[PDB]
Write a protein that binds this ligand. Structure first.
Ligand SMILES: [Zn+2]
Ligand SMILES: [Zn+2]
Lengths: 199, 209
């Protein structure tokens, strides 16, 4: 079988693994990471993208069962072990293939989607959208943010705003800047409403 | 005590009413409705804002999640009796509260209703919508072929529950329901913000699709 058929099989395996997810969230997430990774790969001029595509599609299915499935794709040990290593370490440095899967995954954590995911989690945990703090806005970008009670907005300062600068590839950095800029815009709009006519 | 002192006590009563809210949303929500209502009232040139201020602060005090409407009203009426309000004022406030928990209201009631509605849209509406979906365990969006225009129809009721679905089924219809010019202006900006958020959201959702 060729690479195309193998990727197709990995795609099928992934959907089957998450078939019992009555939200489709898991599958959608994997698909976005996969599509982001493919966009980055081409942009970074990567000839063979088998490792990247397999890693992206299967990174969330975890290794006995994974090794079993991979054992049916007729892959060499070098490639097989390559994918497993990436999935396992997806802190150590990785090959460009691994750093691209990382970038694709990181990108899904920011932007309109990252914001949406963040608020969903807060709602799931019954956390507030935001809380009043005595810390200055500037201090929120430092470790002092850990002193805040959990809130969706806290997560913007503690994690989301730091992801763009962590992108590895130039293409991922570019995509990240757009989504980063958007999150700032959302925050400013959020605060304008939160403090509307408040004084 | 004077008018703003009675308002202060209504504010204190509201914070006590929602004291058990562990999410902190309830109190913050009322403060924003109050602040929006005061903004609209000044811009609409409402002279006496007593009814608007008291009503906005107490607009949801007859909906106790822990108890019931019977005990809630009893407490509310008891609290209002301590403010030494005139018959008309008291009646006006209670009337707004009742129709706050399709009938037309006075300008004062419409302003409170406008302020309340505003808090359902914009960045805040986006946030609460996603939080609710998280609480209900629903996805942020579902796979569908229906176009934007189509989703703005009663056909949206065919999609499975999701956060984005709530944008078309409710959020996007609120701006047109604003009564006062000032609230219509504020809504236009919050409404356009939601449109832009949806566009960005979909651009990421279908990225390199
Ligand atoms: Zn992932
Ligand atoms: Zn309300």
């Amino acid at each position: 079988m060729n690479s195309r058929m193998k990727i197709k099989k990995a795609y099928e395996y992934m959907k089957s693994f998450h078939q019992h997810d009555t939200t489709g969230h898991d599958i959608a997430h994997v698909e976005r990471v996969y599509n982001n990774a493919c966009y980055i790969a081409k942009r970074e001029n990567i000839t063979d993208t088998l490792v990247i595509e397999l890693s992206s599609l299967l990174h969330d299915t975890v290794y006995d069962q994974l090794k079993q499935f991979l054992s049916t794709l007729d892959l060499s040990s070098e490639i097989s072990q390559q994918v497993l290593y990436i999935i396992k370490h997806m802190h150590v440095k990785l090959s460009i293939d691994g750093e691209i899967v990382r970038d694709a995954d990181r990108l899904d954590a920011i932007g309109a989607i990252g914001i949406a995911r963040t608020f969903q989690f807060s709602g799931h945990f019954g956390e507030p959208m935001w809380t009043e703090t005595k810390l200055s806005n500037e201090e929120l970008h430092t470790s002092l943010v850990e002193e805040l009670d959990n809130s969706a907005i806290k997560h913007f300062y503690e994690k989301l705003f730091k992801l763009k600068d962590l992108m590895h590839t130039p293409t991922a950095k570019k995509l990240a800047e757009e989504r980063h800029q958007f999150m700032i815009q959302y925050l400013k709009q959020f605060m304008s409403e939160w403090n509307f006519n408040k004084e």
